[PDB]
Amino acid sequence: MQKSVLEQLKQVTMVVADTGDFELIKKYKPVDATTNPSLILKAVKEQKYSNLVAETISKVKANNPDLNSDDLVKEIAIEILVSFGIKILDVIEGKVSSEVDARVSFNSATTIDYAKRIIARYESNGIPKDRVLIMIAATWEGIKAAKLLQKEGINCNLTLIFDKAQAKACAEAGVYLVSPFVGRITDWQMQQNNLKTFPAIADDDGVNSVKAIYKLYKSHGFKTIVMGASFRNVEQVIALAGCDALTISPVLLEELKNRDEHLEVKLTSPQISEADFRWLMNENAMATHKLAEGIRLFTKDTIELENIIKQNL
Amino acid sequence: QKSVLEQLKQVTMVVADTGDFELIKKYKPVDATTNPSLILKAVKEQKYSNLVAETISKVKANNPDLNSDDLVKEIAIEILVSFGIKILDVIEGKVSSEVDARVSFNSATTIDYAKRIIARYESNGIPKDRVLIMIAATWEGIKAAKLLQKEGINCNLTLIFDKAQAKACAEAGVYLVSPFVGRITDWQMQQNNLKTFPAIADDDGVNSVKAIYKLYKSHGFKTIVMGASFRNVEQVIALAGCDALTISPVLLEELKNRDEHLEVKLTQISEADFRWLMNENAMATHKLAEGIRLFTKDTIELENIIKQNL
Ligand SMILES: O=C(CO)[C@@H](O)[C@H](O)[C@H](O)[C@H](O)COP(=O)(O)O
């Protein structure tokens, strides 16, 4: 019963596919999947699912002849987000992550409203909320929004986690899952230290970040799921075998599928006030920069999606 | 022929950026600014070791109830005030004194620290009109300044790297803003490994202050625009006509010794809005945070010096 590294990983970690390409999701059979604004933009622009995109735009237009261009564009954007999520849910047993508009990242109330709008759109298609994770950037405001959403039974994926303080604050808020990044932390490490080659696993700041969060969570008995995200190579993924969950790009899933060696299982202070959180984040130059950058990048891709929608009106 | 320094004073309030008060006299600035790094420099170089020793003795005597940690904190405030008092003896205007950078994300502790500085000045016979409380321009610092201004305490909002950030300060009714120049140019040079300074027209730091000045003038904001952080005299000269400019003693000396003609060049936001606009500015996001970290490092070093002298 010898198995590939991918199949072995599934025994010790919840394998999640990081893509909007639902057909690819099929050849890897992950439990859950994650979409994000950049992945949705790629799914909209690529030829593969051009029919689905055109149909979604046409349907929303036909069913909302009274809405102005601006309101119509936002309606179409959320419908596209949800349409890809539904196609993904049709091919997996688990949940799909759908991200709120990045432009609401510093407003808890508008984050809550957008989250509820996403959930209502899934519900109108017969998808229960228990199959969806609302993805929210882990700014203080996003964590506050998630805290309230969880109280209403809406599970959240707190993303763009770069510091153990966010992770701790998210756990303290009772969120369903956190997505600490790995690759982007390693990117900063290489640029800051002028590293010509990729660091050894023991020295990889990204890998170590997830390990520290996992250790923190287990020692405190937190039930929030730790899902490593953002990977540069298969070695970083393999290094976190045993983590609660790992969301992995199709390119890397294919690499894992084709490897056959045994997979070694590697994974087996006061409450945070707003001022404390902000201080701790300020102390971390990398996290300060990367959280902000992540929000800007998703915003750029969401604005491009809006422009594309407007071009097809 | 008038020196560039003399010409600058005709169109801009010249301010000395130093805690080394004996150097101030020869430039005759209107106001002066200290900051945590400048206070540390003055203490480390030991020219004012007697002032430091006398301040430590006084605070101990007047505070028999404080433990070691609390005593050091009180001495740090009194040192800030002692330097300010000495500066006020040699200038006609105001002196800026900065709150502990460690309170930058707490409006309440910022307010009380500011009030403590003012109370120490008052106890030493200095009226509050002669003092500006410096506060980093985080949202929390701006909210603290809004309350302080209502209570008659004038504030200097510092570590300003973005125009929307400066607008929010003006909307809070602050007395003065300190938009930085040199640190913005540093970011620009680092981004592209530039070995030479950019042309003035292309200098992001100079352009930031020009943009803030233009906004304030067109909108009628009464907050004073004071450019700060300079790498060379050319950046100072480029902003001639600005409301105020705070300048190092080295650059004041350079201006004093230049005699060419000086061309005069310069003649609401919610919390969520503010945070969004800052986030859109990679440089400002980085530099504001960096400034707080650097001032914190220098405040900790000052505390360590105090501890060694108890
Ligand atoms: O965090 C999640 C889902 O939880 C992912 O979709 C996440 O956004 C992506 O892994 C990252 O944005 C990818 O970043 P990068 O590795 O391409 O720099």
Ligand SMILES: O=C(CO)[C@@H](O)[C@H](O)[C@H](O)[C@H](O)COP(=O)(O)O
């Ligand atoms: O903003 C004020 C006073 O209002 C200044 O004291 C300001 O802190 C200093 O000019 C800067 O910190 C100097 O930084 P740098 O030019 O040495 O990088």
